[PDB]
Amino acid sequence: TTFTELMQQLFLKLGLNHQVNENDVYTFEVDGHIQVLIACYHQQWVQLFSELGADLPTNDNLFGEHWPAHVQGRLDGKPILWSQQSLVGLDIDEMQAWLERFIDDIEQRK
Amino acid sequence: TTFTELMQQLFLKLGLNHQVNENDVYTFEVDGHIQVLIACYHQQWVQLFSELGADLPTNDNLFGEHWPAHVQGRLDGKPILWSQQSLVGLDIDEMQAWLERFIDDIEQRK
Numbered sequence A, B: 001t002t003f004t005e006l007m008q009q010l011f012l013k014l015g016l017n018h019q020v021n022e023n024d025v026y027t028f029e030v031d032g033h034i035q036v037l038i039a040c041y042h043q044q045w046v047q048l049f050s051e052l053g054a055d056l057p058t059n060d061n062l063f064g065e066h067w068p069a070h071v072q073g074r075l076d077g078k079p080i081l082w083s084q085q086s087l088v089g090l091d092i093d094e095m096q097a098w099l100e101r102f103i104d105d106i107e108q109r110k
């Protein structure tokens, strides 16, 4: 199905409150300090995004730890974490696991 | 089809010589200075890998420039570039374009 269908089914299932902006980007907060953005690009890629605060900028950024990989980047000089995967074949179960996995990773870093 | 089917069809089409090792990793050289490794992990992910020499380690590593993204990492303190995408939905045409695109990117950096 489309990104929104997936997104809806996702939040409507996990009973989590969400926030969609004008550009069609979903946001969900973990506890009270973790914000995760989820957008779809070019009708194929699902992007995850979350800020890290003032984490250890020294990250080798190799693939292997996660599938897909969690990449640490520099935005506004400020540390961020992102993950991407194609929509094709993406089921609600994989979506949930990927998120949990990304959420988990965020905490361990912050 | 499987990774190998794809891989074969790829090299057998572009008329490029290749080299498969013991771990089932394909290698292809561009001109005489560019080596690209292609492996499949967990029967789902196709990984691209190539060394950069002594490039500018200062890379923000944001998504957006390419789909999928070309990530710059540190392996053995030495700069590398990688890209990953799921096998599902992956056709020989996308494979070729992704490679060309990765190859291109390597050159511009080295």
Ligand SMILES: [Pt+2]
Pocket (backbone or CB within 6 Å): A041, A042, A043
């Ligand atoms: Pt597009």
Ligand SMILES: [Pt+2]
Pocket (backbone or CB within 6 Å): B041, B042, B043
């Ligand atoms: Pt596996």
